[PDB]
């Protein structure tokens, strides 16, 4: 696979590693989101409960109080967009 | 140390520039650069028919700000749509 294909695969596998722990196995709750960010995006972390709650709210465009794979990809896109600037 | 996910984001960025910087605006993909990025970097996502007509249609669908280019945001919308 190309580096980009491998990258997309890591994006997918990383999501499912955390989303599959509790509740809906295909969505991240606040606990699962916290673990993912803490362990897999440390260089982007400032942290407190309020901060993770705000992030969750911001990402939750479909207003179901969880972060699904699409919402997560949009979040990653925003991080990459920040890094690209 | 950078996590695999952090490195994957770095590759998202670098792959864009690998093609956007060839011609014209160094920070946006023209039709040729977009076709090359897809052909060379996303072969597993390509259809049976990668003819010019199919590609022109794809270009128009990705170009949401109608500037005849695919910028980084538009490219991320694309990757988000195909990822899984």
């Amino acid at each position: 696979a190309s580096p980009l294909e491998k990258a997309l695969d890591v994006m997918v596998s990383t999501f499912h590693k955390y989303s599959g722990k509790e509740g809906d196995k295909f969505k991240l709750n606040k606990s699962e989101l916290k673990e993912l960010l803490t362990r897999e995006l440390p260089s982007f972390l400032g942290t407190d409960e309020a901060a993770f709650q705000k992030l969750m709210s911001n990402l939750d465009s479909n207003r179901d109080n969880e972060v699904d794979f699409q919402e997560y990809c949009v979040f990653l896109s925003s991080i990459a967009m920040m890094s690209n600037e | 140390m950078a996590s695999p996910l952090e490195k994957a984001l770095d590759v998202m960025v670098s792959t864009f520039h690998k093609y956007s910087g060839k011609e014209g605006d160094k920070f946006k993909l023209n039709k040729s650069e977009l076709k090359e990025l897809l052909t060379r970097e996303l072969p597993s996502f390509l259809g049976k028919r990668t003819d010019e007509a199919a590609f022109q249609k794809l270009m128009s669908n990705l170009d949401s700000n109608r500037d005849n280019e695919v910028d980084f945001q538009e490219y991320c919308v694309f990757l988000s749509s195909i990822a899984m």
Binding site: - | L38, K57, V77, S81
Partner: peptide
């Protein structure tokens, strides 16, 4: 992530996905 921009990006991604496999147009599999 500013809510206005996450929400817009999610609409854009949903739109493009729907075109992909509900589902018109096929340079991409």
């Amino acid at each position: 992530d500013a809510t206005e921009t996450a929400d817009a990006m999610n609409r854009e991604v949903s739109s493009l996905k729907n075109k992909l496999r509900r589902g018109d147009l096929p340079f991409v599999v």
